[PDB]
Write a protein that binds this ligand. Structure first.
Ligand SMILES: [Ca+2]
Lengths: 213, 210, 218
């Protein structure tokens, strides 16, 4: 039963650059290999069949090659809209099997996140929980760090973070972090601060509010 | 022209059964092999069944053999997948796909959740506001697909809807924001339209400053 | 940060590995150029072929011994769609006489600074020239930045629009002929803040300057 493997989990490439995604079959599969592109929020789209043939409408910059066990999808002249997970697949035999997926991201100038903070609504306090939200908008390096400080005291264990996929036009990210707290705990302290560090900041940036204002 | 449209995904208890359907159009359905592929939360793709054009040949991987069966109706132009003895590990998005080797067209997917938990509809809370940022917090729902649009889908510039996170309570939660001209606040009305079909919950939340 | 790659030099005639050379390359490349492959060529051997591709940390190179080593030479001409020559460059590679050198855009040679591949047609991105021979190729390019010069004067609105400062500023990188004052707030005079704001038309200000109102801060 033939397995296919993609050894690259993540590749980073600049616009106009070249990027080669690799695929290794555990047995000779001739050219019975296919490639797929999955853009975020979308279902997989068929790019290449039998190792090197493009479907009508797939642009020339997508090139598949290989035979036997080693297969390759080369994206030349990469566009910011080419970001996606790219999957290879062997259909030489049943079971049909897929590689694990190679995420292709675009590199761009460092971009500093714009930071906002949201107090909990009055509907939510009425019901007994308090959710405080920190938004970090349109930044590059995906890497970032959010610290929730209550009355100047750093928290942990009551925060969850979420990151969008890379935007297809500009090539930025956005991040949401939620500080969840009981209504009891919420109105005991006054100062709620969101401490943000990132490569585009020379120092941590803090947004904050006082409960009530 | 080619279109494949799946339905029937639902929340099912472990050990249960459920049947998926796929309505096919834009092509001569009875001439094509057809398949089902699922995608797990870790985004891995796993092929689950294929059927020849006339139904004579069907194929399954060992992970599902004896529990899943594939059929078609070449009069209704419909593909089916019956599943029984469902396990937690069958939780996936199920795609219908054309042909039986590579897959040249895929549908949009329908979502199967195998769990002992019960449906719960979301609470919807406003994230109240150069540019201003406003948004919408969608808290404590369980079966997974929630959809969020702004102003009935007409406002898309600057919208960021964040992936759902799994809270320690077993409930999902999610935020959606958008950036707008600050001078539009107090003229324009901004509505976040939340739909959680697993609970037949539909909310249109006006988000305003205060 | 950099990437460690192992070059596997393999003699397919001898059916033996001749050398496995570890090298370091930029962290975000997946294709190693011929110049690196031949820099670390084991002595007595010549390049026959390589797909350049970094495959789970390895580049595979077919090499051969006791053959004559010759340059493939490529004169690349970069032209813009109207036939005007941006630049010309010659790149070379050495390998076994008569085998194929494959020159690949962005690994073995680069576009002129400020240019990209033209969106007006399909063209090849790899050029195959046998070692011991000379070839030519014209690649069609277009400017990356379409910014135009626009003349602007900042003008004191509380003193009868007296000129404070001015110059010729680059705007409209997309090239649609419209520009916005966000593109020139970098240039507002130091003691002043910009009051006249919005969109403006490039073609209108190549000869007489656009006057933008400004006022003294605080
Ligand atoms: Ca413009």
């Amino acid at each position: 039963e033939t397995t296919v493997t993609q050894s690259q989990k993540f590749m980073s490439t600049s616009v106009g650059d070249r990027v080669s995604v690799t695929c290794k079959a555990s047995q000779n599969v001739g050219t019975n290999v296919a490639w797929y592109q999955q853009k975020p929020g979308q279902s997989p789209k068929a790019l290449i069949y039998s190792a090197s043939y493009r479907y009508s409408g797939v642009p020339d910059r997508f090139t598949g090659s290989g035979s036997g066990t080693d297969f390759t999808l080369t994206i030349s002249n990469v566009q910011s809209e080419d970001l996606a997970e790219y999957f290879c697949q062997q259909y030489n035999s049943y079971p049909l099997t897929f590689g694990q997926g190679t995420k292709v991201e675009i590199k761009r100038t460092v971009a500093a996140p714009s930071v906002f903070i949201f107090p909990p609504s009055d509907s939510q306090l009425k019901s007994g929980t308090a959710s405080v939200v920190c938004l970090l908008n349109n930044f590059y390096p995906r890497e970032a760090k959010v610290q929730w400080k209550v009355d100047n005291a750093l928290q942990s264990g009551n925060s969850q973070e979420s990151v969008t996929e890379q935007d297809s036009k500009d090539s930025t990210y956005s991040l949401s972090s939620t500080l969840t707290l009981s209504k009891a705990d919420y109105e005991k302290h006054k100062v709620y601060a969101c401490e943000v560090t990132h490569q585009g900041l020379s120092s941590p940036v803090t947004k904050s509010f006082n409960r009530g204002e | 022209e080619v279109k494949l449209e799946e339905s029937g995904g639902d929340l099912v208890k472990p050990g249960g059964s459920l049947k998926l359907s796929c309505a096919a159009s834009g092509f001569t359905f009875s001439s094509y092999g057809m398949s089902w592929v699922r995608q797990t939360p870790d985004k891995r793709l796993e092929w689950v069944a294929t059927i020849s054009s006339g139904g004579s040949y069907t194929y399954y991987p060992d992970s599902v053999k004896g529990r899943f069966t594939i059929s078609r109706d070449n009069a209704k132009n419909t593909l089916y997948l019956q599943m029984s003895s469902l396990k937690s590990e069958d939780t996936a998005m199920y795609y219908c796909a054309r042909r039986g080797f590579y897959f040249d067209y895929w549908g949009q997917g329908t979502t199967l959740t195998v769990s002992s938990a019960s449906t719960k509809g979301p609470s919807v809370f406003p994230l109240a506001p150069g540019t201003a940022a406003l948004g919408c917090l969608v808290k404590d729902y369980f079966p997974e697909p929630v959809t969020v649009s702004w102003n009935s889908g007409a406002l898309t510039s600057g919208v960021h809807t964040f992936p759902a996170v799994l809270q320690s309570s077993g409930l999902y939660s999610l935020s959606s924001v958008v950036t707008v001209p600050s001078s539009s606040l107090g003229t324009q009305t901004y509505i976040c339209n939340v739909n959680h079909k697993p609970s037949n919950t539909k909310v249109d939340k006006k988000v305003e400053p205060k | 940060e950099v990437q460690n790659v192992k070059i596997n030099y393999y003699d397919e005639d001898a059916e033996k590995q001749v050398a496995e050379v570890p090298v370091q390359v930029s962290i975000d490349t997946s294709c190693v150029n011929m110049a690196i492959l031949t820099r670390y060529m084991p002595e007595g051997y010549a390049l026959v072929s390589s797909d350049c591709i970094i495959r789970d940390g390895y580049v595979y190179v077919s090499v051969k011994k006791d053959v004559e080593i010759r340059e493939a030479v490529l004169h690349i001409t970069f032209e813009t769609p109207n036939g005007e020559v941006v630049t010309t460059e010659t790149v070379t590679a050495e390998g076994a006489d008569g085998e194929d050198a494959v020159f690949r855009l962005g690994v073995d040679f680069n576009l002129p600074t400020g240019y990209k591949l033209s969106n007006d047609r399909d063209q090849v991105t790899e050029i195959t020239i046998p070692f011991g021979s000379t070839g030519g190729h014209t690649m069609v390019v277009e400017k990356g930045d379409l910014s135009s010069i626009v003349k602007i004067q900042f003008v004191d609105a509380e003193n009868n629009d007296e000129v404070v400062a001015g110059g010729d500023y680059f705007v409209d990188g997309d090239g649609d002929g419209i520009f916005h004052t966000r593109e020139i707030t970098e240039w507002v005079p130091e003691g002043y803040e910009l009051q006249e704001v919005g969109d403006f038309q490039v073609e209108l200000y190549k000869e007489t300057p656009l006057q933008l109102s400004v006022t003294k801060i605080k």
